[PDB]
Antibody
């Protein structure tokens, strides 16, 4: 397929620097313009930078001009955003995106990569079970989950049974505690009859701190 | 720099309804305008390029209109999966500005939450803290009130909420409230209630447990 894969985003220091790469595939990169668009969490889209197919021209947003540098290596099929003098307002998911016609329309986008500009420390999460019980049952359905507490920075991915369980799942948005660390919950609603027959294991991955917890969640009465 | 304004900034409509989102550029920008849909936790997706033309594979119920300083995205008949935030972008004169976005959420029939409570885990209790979670599952509308009680005493300041985005199939929401207090304080009390107010509930519903069972 036509494709765009971001990498290299993650935790970085204020006044620091970071490099963003975009592994293009599925078409010939040499052919069209390219773009970086950022989205600060819970906020709107903001165009950062654009670059022609040769490398010819590069244009930048005002707020990033003189700090950020866009570049493309056609030979290995990759797009770059060199980020210098990182400020707090640069914290954002940065999207790799391909242009189309003379429309200036972006017709395909990568799935983004989080950049966090913070002095705060990395910290892996603790995964506690959210045990099902009768206080967790209401008419053949039983709810259960995992509490992914005290972690920094974003994100954590949570799966259930390696990926085998997707139905009834509700992995919540994270909330920043007063302690400066994030916390989230993933819950699932299953049949109550399966409680002593079927295993339930939440799979938590917090890459920025390199943590990989599998927690078994067992019934309470 | 041309300031793109979208209106409305948020909107509620039912399935099959006609939706009209307005994007206004503060100077003529010919037919250089583009429509993007952003579903949650996912990348934007081009809908209307050239202010009126449709990207391939994009449902024909989406339509673009306008030139000069006034543009419209129209969805002819809304559907569950159309839940998203919609952005216009002028591609005419650099810097390439974006509209501030329009949040489209689906109106559906009232659903009351299924409420569940979870005491803190033995594992956490060791570590020194106690997190009690209350879960409100699959309800419409989004507006809901969760009150924590500790031995019938109303709690304030010691809790945090999180709402899932609207479910693209059945248009419902889920909420989790997390009461966090110290093992010291947690062990000073017996009854831990979660009292939930909602439209789809005749009267507030309480879920509780006694520390020790």
């Amino acid at each position: 397929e036509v494709q765009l894969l971001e990498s290299g985003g993650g935790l970085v220091q204020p006044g620091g620097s970071l490099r963003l790469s975009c592994a293009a595939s599925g078409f010939t990169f040499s052919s069209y313009a390219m773009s970086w668009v950022r989205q600060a969490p819970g906020k709107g889209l903001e165009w950062v930078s654009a670059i022609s197919g040769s490398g010819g021209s590069t244009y930048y947003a005002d707020s990033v001009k003189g700090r950020f540098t866009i570049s493309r290596d056609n030979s290995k099929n990759t797009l770059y955003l060199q980020m210098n003098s990182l400020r707090a307002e640069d914290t954002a998911v940065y999207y790799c995106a391909k242009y189309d016609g003379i429309y200036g329309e972006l017709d395909f986008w990568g799935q983004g990569t989080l950049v966090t500009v913070s002095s705060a420390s990395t910290k892996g999460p603790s995964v506690f079970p959210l045990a099902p019980s009768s206080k967790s049952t209401s008419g053949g359905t039983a709810a259960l989950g995992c509490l992914v507490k005290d972690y920094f920075p974003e994100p954590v991915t949570v799966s259930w049974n390696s990926g085998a369980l997707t139905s009834g799942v509700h992995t919540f948005p994270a909330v920043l505690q007063s302690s400066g660390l994030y916390s989230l919950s993933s819950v699932v609603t299953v049949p109550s009859s399966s409680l002593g027959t079927q295993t339930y294991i939440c799979n938590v991955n917090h890459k920025p701190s390199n943590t990989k917890v599998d927690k078994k969640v067992e019934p309470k009465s | 720099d041309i300031q793109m304004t979208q209106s409305p900034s948020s909107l509620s409509a039912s399935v099959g309804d006609r939706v009209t989102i307005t994007c206004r550029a503060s100077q003529s920008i010919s037919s250089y305008l583009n429509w993007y849909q952003q579903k949650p936790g996912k990348a934007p997706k081009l809908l209307i390029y050239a202010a009126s033309s449709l990207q391939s594979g994009v449902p024909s119920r989406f339509s673009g209109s306008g030139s000069g300083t006034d543009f419209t995205l129209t969805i002819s008949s809304l559907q569950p999966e159309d839940f998203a935030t919609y952005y216009c972008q002028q591609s005419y004169s650099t810097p390439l500005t974006f509209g501030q976005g329009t949040k489209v959420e689906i109106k559906r029939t009232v659903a009351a939450p299924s409420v569940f409570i979870f005491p803190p885990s033995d594992e956490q209790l060791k570590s020194g803290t106690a997190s009690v979670v209350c879960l409100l599952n699959n309800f419409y509308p989004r507006e809901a009130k969760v009150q924590w009680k500790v031995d019938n005493a109303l709690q304030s300041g010691n809790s945090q909420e999180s709402v899932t985005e609207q479910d693209s199939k059945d248009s419902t929401y889920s909420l989790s409230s997390t009461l966090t207090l110290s093992k010291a304080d947690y062990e000073k009390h017996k009854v831990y209630a979660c009292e939930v107010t909602h439209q789809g509930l005749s009267s507030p519903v309480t879920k509780s447990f006694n520390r020790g069972e």
